[model samples]
Target: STTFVALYDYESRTETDLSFKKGERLQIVNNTEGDWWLAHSLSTGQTGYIPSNYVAPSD
Candidate 1:
């Protein structure tokens, strides 16, 4: 189910695809793409990639 706010996966330095549930708030475990992942926090519909471990369940 897609919502106005939904959790997503952040593919890190590997070829694996991470999975995130809706309302998940994760931490920045590690980042190699610099601030490129910040684009996801924009309300203007920005797009980009972030570290997998950087995001976790909001609960």
Candidate 2:
């Protein structure tokens, strides 16, 4: 699945962050720190790191 990146500061107080827009989403690839490596299903597979702390997942 793909996720979105917080263009600004974001806080993770629950299952979701309080800084990201609900409709807005980004592609989540390799996670590092609180960021995600974004890359579309098409185009050149460009990967980068973004803050992943804002998102909560059951492990």
Candidate 3:
């Protein structure tokens, strides 16, 4: 269960997209993209890609 913390508020691009606020906790599910990482929101159980620079290691 990889985890990260959101660095700022992010508004996803679609209806099915996952949105998050600053300081929100996210679970890293996929890191295949060079700039975007798939993350599961710990608070909402929503999943999607967020920019790598927008998140940081929880540890």
Among these predictions, the greatest lDDT belongs to 3
User: Poorest 10 consecutive residues of model 3 by lDDT?
Assistant: 29-38
Query: Which residue pairs show collisions in model 1?
Result: 24-58, 26-55, 26-56
Q: Candidate 1, residues 1-59: lDDT per residue as tens digits? A: 11123355443454332334445443332344554333243233434444433454332
> Model 1: how far is 38 from its true place, Å?
14
In order of appearance, the predictions have TM-scores of 0.26, 0.27, 0.80
- Which parts of model 1 are misplaced by more than 4 Å? 1-15, 32-59
Top of the candidates by TM-score: 3
RMSD of 2: 9.6
lDDT for each of the candidates?
Answer: 0.38, 0.40, 0.83
lDDT score, residue 12, model 3?
90
Q: Tens-digit lDDT track for model 3 on 1-59? A: 37899889999987555689999999996665687777888899888878888888885
Instruction: Tell how far residue 27 is off in model 1, in angstroms.
Output: 2.0
What is the C-alpha lDDT profile of model 2 across 1-59, one tens digit per residue? 34454444433454432334333344664455434443222222333333555443322
Ranking by lDDT: 3, 2, 1
Global local distance difference test of model 1: 0.38
Tally clashing residue pairs in candidate 3.
0
